[PDB]
Structures are given as structure tokens and as C-alpha cells.
Design an enzyme around this catalytic site. Structure first.
Site, mmCIF file in Angstrom:
data_model
loop_
_atom_site.group_PDB
_atom_site.id
_atom_site.type_symbol
_atom_site.label_atom_id
_atom_site.label_comp_id
_atom_site.label_asym_id
_atom_site.label_seq_id
_atom_site.Cartn_x
_atom_site.Cartn_y
_atom_site.Cartn_z
ATOM 1 N N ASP A 158 0.839 -1.211 0.000
ATOM 2 C CA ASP A 158 0.000 0.000 0.000
ATOM 3 C C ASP A 158 0.874 1.262 0.000
ATOM 4 O O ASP A 158 1.995 1.271 0.589
ATOM 5 C CB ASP A 158 -0.909 0.048 1.234
ATOM 6 C CG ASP A 158 -2.137 -0.828 1.116
ATOM 7 O OD1 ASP A 158 -2.166 -1.743 0.278
ATOM 8 O OD2 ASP A 158 -3.080 -0.564 1.863
ATOM 9 N N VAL A 159 0.319 2.340 -0.578
ATOM 10 C CA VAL A 159 0.982 3.632 -0.670
ATOM 11 C C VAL A 159 0.711 4.540 0.538
ATOM 12 O O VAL A 159 1.496 5.437 0.815
ATOM 13 C CB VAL A 159 0.594 4.369 -1.970
ATOM 14 C CG1 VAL A 159 -0.836 4.939 -1.907
ATOM 15 C CG2 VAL A 159 1.578 5.492 -2.216
ATOM 16 N N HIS A 219 -1.415 -9.670 9.665
ATOM 17 C CA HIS A 219 -2.311 -8.504 9.866
ATOM 18 C C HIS A 219 -2.219 -8.091 11.349
ATOM 19 O O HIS A 219 -2.254 -8.946 12.229
ATOM 20 C CB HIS A 219 -3.702 -8.902 9.456
ATOM 21 C CG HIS A 219 -4.718 -7.775 9.473
ATOM 22 N ND1 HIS A 219 -4.979 -7.030 10.564
ATOM 23 C CD2 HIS A 219 -5.580 -7.327 8.492
ATOM 24 C CE1 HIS A 219 -5.932 -6.131 10.280
ATOM 25 N NE2 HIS A 219 -6.317 -6.330 9.022
ATOM 26 N N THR A 258 -11.292 -13.045 9.843
ATOM 27 C CA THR A 258 -12.284 -12.648 8.896
ATOM 28 C C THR A 258 -12.017 -13.085 7.468
ATOM 29 O O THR A 258 -12.114 -12.269 6.539
ATOM 30 C CB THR A 258 -12.501 -11.146 8.907
ATOM 31 O OG1 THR A 258 -11.310 -10.485 8.463
ATOM 32 C CG2 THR A 258 -12.928 -10.711 10.318
ATOM 33 N N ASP A 262 0.000 0.106 12.930
ATOM 34 C CA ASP A 262 -0.670 1.392 13.046
ATOM 35 C C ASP A 262 -0.581 1.853 14.475
ATOM 36 O O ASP A 262 -1.317 1.338 15.329
ATOM 37 C CB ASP A 262 -2.104 1.226 12.634
ATOM 38 C CG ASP A 262 -2.887 2.535 12.673
ATOM 39 O OD1 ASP A 262 -2.440 3.542 13.300
ATOM 40 O OD2 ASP A 262 -3.932 2.529 12.020
ATOM 41 N N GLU A 279 -7.556 -9.008 -0.165
ATOM 42 C CA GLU A 279 -7.026 -9.607 1.034
ATOM 43 C C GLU A 279 -7.623 -10.976 1.254
ATOM 44 O O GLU A 279 -6.931 -11.927 1.690
ATOM 45 C CB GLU A 279 -7.252 -8.678 2.225
ATOM 46 C CG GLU A 279 -6.754 -9.160 3.572
ATOM 47 C CD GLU A 279 -6.896 -8.111 4.639
ATOM 48 O OE1 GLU A 279 -7.914 -8.149 5.373
ATOM 49 O OE2 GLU A 279 -6.016 -7.213 4.712
HETATM 50 O O1 LIG Z 1 -8.527 5.433 -4.693
HETATM 51 C C1 LIG Z 1 -7.646 4.606 -4.441
HETATM 52 C C2 LIG Z 1 -7.934 3.482 -3.656
HETATM 53 C C3 LIG Z 1 -6.911 2.579 -3.408
HETATM 54 N N1 LIG Z 1 -5.603 2.823 -3.927
HETATM 55 C C4 LIG Z 1 -4.513 1.857 -3.681
HETATM 56 O O2 LIG Z 1 -4.993 0.614 -3.114
HETATM 57 C C5 LIG Z 1 -4.393 0.549 -1.766
HETATM 58 C C6 LIG Z 1 -5.486 -0.073 -0.855
HETATM 59 O O3 LIG Z 1 -6.566 0.784 -0.508
HETATM 60 P P1 LIG Z 1 -6.494 1.396 0.928
HETATM 61 O O4 LIG Z 1 -5.099 1.621 1.398
HETATM 62 O O5 LIG Z 1 -7.475 2.482 0.785
HETATM 63 O O6 LIG Z 1 -7.221 0.272 1.845
HETATM 64 P P2 LIG Z 1 -6.949 0.229 3.384
HETATM 65 O O7 LIG Z 1 -5.504 -0.160 3.634
HETATM 66 O O8 LIG Z 1 -7.250 1.564 4.020
HETATM 67 O O9 LIG Z 1 -7.943 -0.827 3.904
HETATM 68 C C7 LIG Z 1 -3.947 1.959 -1.412
HETATM 69 O O10 LIG Z 1 -2.831 1.940 -0.516
HETATM 70 C C8 LIG Z 1 -3.483 2.475 -2.742
HETATM 71 O O11 LIG Z 1 -2.260 1.881 -3.132
HETATM 72 C C9 LIG Z 1 -5.300 3.963 -4.713
HETATM 73 O O12 LIG Z 1 -4.157 4.190 -5.165
HETATM 74 N N2 LIG Z 1 -6.339 4.858 -4.935
HETATM 75 O O1 LIG Z 2 -10.185 -4.402 1.988
HETATM 76 C C1 LIG Z 2 -9.097 -4.859 1.170
HETATM 77 C C2 LIG Z 2 -7.803 -4.137 1.613
HETATM 78 O O2 LIG Z 2 -7.491 -4.676 2.891
HETATM 79 C C3 LIG Z 2 -6.568 -3.818 3.559
HETATM 80 O O3 LIG Z 2 -6.487 -4.321 4.885
HETATM 81 C C4 LIG Z 2 -5.220 -3.918 2.804
HETATM 82 O O4 LIG Z 2 -4.374 -3.032 3.445
HETATM 83 C C5 LIG Z 2 -5.356 -3.539 1.354
HETATM 84 O O5 LIG Z 2 -4.186 -3.848 0.636
HETATM 85 C C6 LIG Z 2 -6.545 -4.238 0.693
HETATM 86 O O6 LIG Z 2 -6.139 -5.569 0.455
HETATM 87 O O1 LIG Z 3 -10.724 -8.123 9.081
HETATM 88 C C1 LIG Z 3 -10.096 -7.681 7.891
HETATM 89 C C2 LIG Z 3 -10.101 -6.145 7.875
HETATM 90 O O2 LIG Z 3 -9.611 -5.743 9.139
HETATM 91 C C3 LIG Z 3 -9.579 -4.312 9.279
HETATM 92 O O3 LIG Z 3 -8.856 -4.086 10.436
HETATM 93 C C4 LIG Z 3 -8.829 -3.551 8.181
HETATM 94 O O4 LIG Z 3 -9.045 -2.153 8.300
HETATM 95 C C5 LIG Z 3 -9.345 -3.976 6.851
HETATM 96 O O5 LIG Z 3 -8.558 -3.308 5.901
HETATM 97 C C6 LIG Z 3 -9.268 -5.505 6.724
HETATM 98 O O6 LIG Z 3 -7.909 -5.977 6.748
HETATM 99 MN MN LIG Z 4 -3.853 1.078 2.997
#
Ligand SMILES: O=c1ccn([C@@H]2O[C@H](COP(=O)(O)OP(=O)(O)O)[C@@H](O)[C@H]2O)c(=O)[nH]1
Ligand SMILES: OC[C@H]1O[C@@H](O)[C@H](O)[C@@H](O)[C@H]1O
Ligand SMILES: OC[C@H]1O[C@@H](O)[C@H](O)[C@@H](O)[C@H]1O
Ligand SMILES: [Mn+2]
EC number: 2.4.1.40
Length: 279
Positions: free
Chosen positions: A143-144, A165, A177, A258, A235
């Protein structure tokens, strides 16, 4: 080259599991001597590719991502950043150390956040195919929305790895999950599963990451044609893949944390790569 002798009867980490039951190392501080590993990897002239997507507003996350990768990620080794973006002009030009480069790959933006996340597998796969093959030995996919805060190096490198995770490493598997509906290709029975791997940090040799991403993409298409979306999208499919194709290393949650949500517990001696606050 001279270093502390490992002592068979005085394990450094006694508080955590440091190898999986299929004998893959679980990477924690105190399990590795980075000097030995750096030399092993340097002698092969190892090149590491790091893929990151920054689609739409996520371009804002690149400057800190890249600056902190320059500080902490594979320092001393050859690195190729691949930034996938719909906005090539918005990529910040960060100054890089020697032996490090960055390529910008323009790609389309999907409207839904789910599809942007999900279509990464297809895009890593992509077809960015004989290109990753000729250019790097390993691919790391993250992720970015993150920053590096401490050493992430060659200790992670192996044919296939996933990352625990951070919100599930202390839990039991029925609490994981996973996708629990059997209509989904991502389905994992309730009595199965080793770990809950997080979608934000996986990798491996280029051949293994291409396998993984091709499989996850083929599995997501099957679900779509069946009108189902897995509960946690890529995921979910990553977890299913890593159940059946076990990783040859597992990274501890030091590698995906985090501090805002979870603090800094004693079991974490370093917080290496962490979420950046966002909406
Ligand atoms: O509008 C978007 C949504 C997602 N991402 C990419 O997909 C990853 C996963 O989405 P995000 O990090 O939002 O999910 P989270 O980690 O918050 O669950 C991001 O880190 C970005 O690399 C992006 O570039 N633009
Ligand atoms: O909800 C799906 C997402 O789950 C987040 O936890 C993870 O950081 C992302 O890379 C994407 O896989
Ligand atoms: O349970 C899976 C989910 O758990 C959350 O903590 C996280 O924000 C999601 O991105 C996904 O990984
Ligand atoms: Mn992310």
C-alpha cells in the site's frame, strides 16, 4: 566477518513464534543478523522491485512513502520503484540514493475503491510480465498510504512471503475474517487456516509473485461472473492463496503496524512500516 555467536541453548526471542510449522521463518527483530544477510544478497547483486499504486487522491501519499523508503527500504541494494498511477505528472520527484530508480506506469482508474484495490493483482500481473522478469529478482507489493519508520531489508526476501495482519496476530482462527461463504473462490472452511495475512504487504521472487497475482486475479473474475464479492476483496483472495501455497517467510507485524490504533506494545521492538492517518 565477525559477529555474536548464535547459542543453541539461549534463544534470542522466547516471547514469540519465530518459525511456522512448515518451517518458514517468522521475521522479528532479534532473529536475524543483517550483516550476514546483506552480504549474502549483495554477492548475488540482488535487485528488488517495489510496486505501489497511487490512483486518484492517493498520489498525495507518494512523497512521504518515497522519502522514507529512501531512508529505510533495502538501503545498499539495488531498488526499482514501480509507481502505478493515473496521474504521471503528480508523482513527486524524490532524490534517490545510488543504484536506485523509479519508473512511472500510467494505468486506468477504476471508479470504486474496491476495484482499484482489487485490480492491483491484474495490474501487477498485468501485463507487466517479461518486464519485472528481466529487471528485478524480487517483487515487493505494498500500500501507498504508509511510511517507513525503521529498517525494512533483505531479511524479508524469499520465494514467497506474506505479513501478519496487526489486528489479528494474537487471535484464534475462527475469529479470522476469511471469506466464509463457499460460493466464493476465497472460501476457507472454519476449521482451516494458519494466519490472517494482510493485503498491504506481500512479495517474493518475480515468478512467485506473478503466480500469486495471476491466481488471485483469475479467482476474483470467477467470483464476479458468479455475482459475489469476497468480504475483504483482494485480502480475502490473498489469504486463500497463502493457505494453499504456504509462504516461505512470514513477516511479523513490525512490518505492518498502526501506532494510532494499536500503540506500541513491548512485543514490537521496532515499528518498521506503518499506516499514515487518512479518511
Ligand atoms: O482510490 C484509491 C484506492 C486505493 N488505492 C490503492 O490501493 C491501496 C489499498 O486501498 P487502501 O489503502 O485504501 O485500503 P486500506 O488499507 O485503508 O484498507 C492503497 O494503498 C493504494 O495503493 C489507490 O491508489 N487509490
Ligand atoms: O479491503 C481490502 C484491503 O485490505 C486492507 O487491509 C489492505 O491493506 C489492502 O491492501 C486491501 O487488500
Ligand atoms: O478483518 C479484515 C479487515 O480488518 C480491518 O482491520 C482492516 O481495516 C481492513 O482493511 C481488513 O484488513
Ligand atoms: Mn492502505
Amino acid at each position: 566477518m565477525v559477529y555474536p555467536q548464535p547459542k543453541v541453548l539461549t534463544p534470542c526471542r522466547k516471547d514469540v513464534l519465530v518459525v511456522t510449522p512448515w518451517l518458514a521463518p517468522i521475521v522479528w527483530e532479534g532473529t536475524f543478523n543483517i550483516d550476514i544477510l546483506n552480504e549474502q544478497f549483495r554477492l548475488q547483486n540482488t535487485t528488488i522491485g517495489l510496486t505501489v499504486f497511487a490512483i486518484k487522491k492517493y498520489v498525495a501519499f507518494l512523497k512521504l512513502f518515497l522519502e522514507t523508503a529512501e531512508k529505510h527500504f533495502m538501503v545498499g541494494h539495488r531498488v526499482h520503484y514501480y509507481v502505478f498511477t493515473d496521474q504521471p505528472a503528480a508523482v513527486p520527484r524524490v532524490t534517490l540514493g545510488t543504484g536506485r530508480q523509479l519508473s512511472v506506469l500510467e494505468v486506468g482508474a477504476y471508479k470504486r475503491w474496491q476495484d482499484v484495490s482489487m485490480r492491483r493483482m491484474e495490474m501487477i500481473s498485468d501485463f507487466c510480465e517479461r518486464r519485472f522478469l528481466s529487471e528485478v529478482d524480487y517483487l515487493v507489493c505494498v500500500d501507498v498510504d504508509m511510511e517507513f519508520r525503521d529498517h525494512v531489508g533483505v531479511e524479508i526476501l524469499t520465494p514467497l512471503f506474506g505479513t501478519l495482519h496487526p489486528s489479528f496476530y494474537g487471535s484464534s482462527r475462527e475469529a479470522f475474517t476469511y471469506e466464509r461463504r463457499p460460493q466464493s473462490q476465497a472460501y476457507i472452511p472454519k476449521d482451516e487456516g494458519d494466519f490472517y495475512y494482510m493485503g498491504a504487504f506481500f512479495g517474493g521472487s518475480v515468478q512467485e509473485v506473478q503466480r500469486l497475482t495471476r491466481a488471485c486475479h483469475q479467482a476474483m473474475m470467477v467470483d464476479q461472473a458468479n455475482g459475489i464479492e469476497a468480504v475483504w476483496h483482494d485480502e480475502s483472495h490473498l489469504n486463500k492463496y497463502l493457505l494453499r501455497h504456504k509462504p516461505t517467510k512470514v513477516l511479523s507485524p513490525e512490518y505492518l503496524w498502526d501506532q494510532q490504533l494499536l500503540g506500541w506494545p513491548a512485543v514490537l521492538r521496532k515499528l518498521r512500516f506503518t499506516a499514515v492517518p487518512k479518511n
